[PDB]
Design an enzyme around this catalytic site. Sequence first.
Site, short mmCIF file in Angstrom:
data_model
loop_
_atom_site.label_atom_id
_atom_site.label_comp_id
_atom_site.label_asym_id
_atom_site.label_seq_id
_atom_site.Cartn_x
_atom_site.Cartn_y
_atom_site.Cartn_z
CE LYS B 50 1.11 -1.56 -3.75
NZ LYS B 50 2.25 -2.13 -3.98
CG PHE B 91 -8.93 8.34 11.95
CD1 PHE B 91 -9.02 9.47 12.04
CD2 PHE B 91 -7.32 8.31 12.80
CE1 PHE B 91 -9.01 10.34 12.86
CE2 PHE B 91 -7.56 9.16 13.47
CZ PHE B 91 -7.48 10.09 13.73
CG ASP B 96 -2.90 13.10 6.40
OD1 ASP B 96 -3.49 14.00 7.41
OD2 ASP B 96 -2.29 12.24 7.19
CG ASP B 100 -1.69 17.06 2.65
OD1 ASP B 100 -2.25 17.55 3.45
OD2 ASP B 100 -2.23 15.85 2.07
NE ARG B 105 -4.26 8.55 0.02
CZ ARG B 105 -3.43 9.41 0.49
NH1 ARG B 105 -2.54 8.22 0.58
NH2 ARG B 105 -3.31 10.04 1.26
CG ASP B 167 4.08 17.36 6.95
OD1 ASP B 167 5.69 17.65 6.16
OD2 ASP B 167 3.02 17.53 6.07
CE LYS B 193 1.76 13.54 7.67
NZ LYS B 193 1.92 14.80 6.38
CG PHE B 232 8.97 3.37 3.96
CD1 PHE B 232 8.53 1.87 3.72
CD2 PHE B 232 8.17 4.27 4.58
CE1 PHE B 232 7.53 2.15 3.19
CE2 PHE B 232 6.32 4.43 3.73
CZ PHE B 232 6.96 3.27 2.07
CG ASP B 236 7.59 7.42 0.30
OD1 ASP B 236 6.87 5.94 -0.96
OD2 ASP B 236 6.84 7.43 0.03
CG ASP B 237 10.06 11.79 0.16
OD1 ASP B 237 8.98 11.53 0.60
OD2 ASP B 237 10.43 12.29 1.60
#
Lengths: 343, 343
Positions: B50, B91, B96, B100, B105, B167, B193, B232, B236-237
């Site tokens: 976005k 990047f 990531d 992970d 994505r 993390d 992060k 934020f 988000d979580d």
Amino acid sequence: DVYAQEKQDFVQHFSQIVRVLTEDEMGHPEIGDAIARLKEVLEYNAIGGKYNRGLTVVVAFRELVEPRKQDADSLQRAWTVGWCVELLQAFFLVADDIMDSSLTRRGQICWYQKPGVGLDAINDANLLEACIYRLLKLYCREQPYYLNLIELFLQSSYQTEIGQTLDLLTAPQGNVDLVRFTEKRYKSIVKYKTAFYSFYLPIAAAMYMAGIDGEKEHANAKKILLEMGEFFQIQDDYLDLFGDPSVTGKIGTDIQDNKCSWLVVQCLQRATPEQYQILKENYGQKEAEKVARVKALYEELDLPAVFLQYEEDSYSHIMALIEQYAAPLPPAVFLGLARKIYK
Amino acid sequence: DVYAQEKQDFVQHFSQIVRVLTEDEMGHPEIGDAIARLKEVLEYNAIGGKYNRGLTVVVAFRELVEPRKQDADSLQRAWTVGWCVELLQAFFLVADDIMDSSLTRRGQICWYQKPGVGLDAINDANLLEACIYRLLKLYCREQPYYLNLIELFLQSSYQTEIGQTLDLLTAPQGNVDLVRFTEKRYKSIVKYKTAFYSFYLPIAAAMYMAGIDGEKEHANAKKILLEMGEFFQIQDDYLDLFGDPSVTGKIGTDIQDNKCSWLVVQCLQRATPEQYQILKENYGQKEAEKVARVKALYEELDLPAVFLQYEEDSYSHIMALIEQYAAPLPPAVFLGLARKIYK
Ligand SMILES: COc1ccc2c(CC(=O)O)coc2c1
Ligand SMILES: COc1ccc2c(CC(=O)O)coc2c1
Ligand SMILES: COc1ccc2c(CC(=O)O)coc2c1
Ligand SMILES: COc1ccc2c(CC(=O)O)coc2c1
């Protein structure tokens, strides 16, 4: 000699480098656990090599700068920018070992191969690249050449990356296509992927610290240096197959790893449909039988002789380049390097 | 609104960005094959989102700079520095997703997951980071804020990396240890992060282009911005488990992926030995049965209510921070962002 009596002060400065990159950060206990990890990454990937690149910075510094302008401070920065070059490399190697799926490096286990690290090494490599710029700020923030080094390292990082892309495109992991192993492609790879950060960056850095920022001057240094880089790599591929492990301290595996070696590139030119049919049949095989076959086809094509001939011409050409583009730089700067690679 | 009538000119400038990052490099046909690859990497990982970060740069620019000082040139650079932020993120995400071991994505397949790419994505991510600085040189080389942006992006890259390390240390892939999922660690992760490059970097960039380089001023902006960043992420979580996919456009999997979510961090505080025994038993399981169990334990602990309460306080605190550290900046700069995240 000049390198021998410098390694001492160089490798000794690593403790300060680490200390700085951690103690100052300890001003924030929150990230203390990360900084602890960061220290492990550094003490494992930075240390170990011969530091020929990092030292070139220190050595060239002394020559380019007046004997009375080499105080404590100037030497402290020089050793730092020296380690930055070394860190840039650590960053490249850590990441390349993952991509190539390597098992060992310098005889020891590859960082990502250690238990508990794995792909997290990707972030570890990035941290190493980050330290470079943290050091340039902690030591050269106020120097008149600060922006030049930042741009130098950035540029070198880019060039090595573009070069790395070429190599990946040339030898796809799962595509024994000796068709694209041209001599022209080989030189483009060596230039961007090795020559630039291995020979130009170390000297270029020293030059900027010495006030030599003239574009033309750097244009001449790069001219000489990229030629040495090109020879360095070709001697590296050669020695990998025809060298002696007890001396080189390395066990060759270029033929097996199905690499775009200089030898195989030459082997493909001076070859007939019958020669190629064999090569295209034993290249990239893990058989001690098939490997020895490719070697034989090399000896059979007088490649070893082709190398010596190339070395002879090379040395002449470099010396010719040095006798013309060395100035205003002391020829000793380039002579010392040539006497380091032309074993 | 302000973002809506900017996306047009923004996303349209991407063609120039790509063109520049390739045509100029075509001055060296040798690396032409790499540049071709580079284009594929960009048109696949940069485009799609976005652009809220990239646009914040453009939007904040217009407000901070006088209406008559926003000529063609100034806007061209602004859109560029805007895309640089977007590239920095590309990047981070590319890299990531590998670490992970992600599959998708933005609903599409992860770059490294595509056939033929694989771990080579590691080099591709590095190239993306490299373009950032190539752009700063091609557009702001002569600007008085050039060194500030270079150092800004570098610093942001470092912070995000340190955060990423934390993390990884907190949730080891193969260690369902909810013991280290503290609230204190959660905030340190979110700060380094996410908060830094997501909210501070976009604004900080705009400020420097506007001449606002005052340390204290940046110290106040960062103060406000890091608070929004912290909210934020917590929103988000939350939304990830109690949100509605048809609206959010995303399917939550925090409980399964055994992430250090804000919810589970809260769930651990307000919990008794019996509560924990259950959580420590169904967290990180791919069972649609065990997942629904953890959700129930959250609702049972009034966490959803705990969120709303947190949101309420948050909004108040941010507004309090804005009414005090906004100046000399126009409150509208921070008000616009708050009205973007406080859905
Ligand atoms: C820039 O000077 C150099 C660069 C590399 C080398 C090497 C190989 C290595 O240790 O990597 C030997 O001497 C060098 C001298
Ligand atoms: C390839 O064969 C040779 C033979 C002699 C030499 C020399 C002479 C020297 O500088 O010591 C340099 O490179 C050589 C290469
Ligand atoms: C800096 O302003 C922002 C940053 C991020 C966001 C998001 C989430 C996203 O699209 O990544 C929505 O609005 C934003 C506004
Ligand atoms: C958490 O509950 C709330 C309720 C109302 C609000 C508002 C009012 C508004 O700015 O529109 C902001 O955040 C809220 C959060």
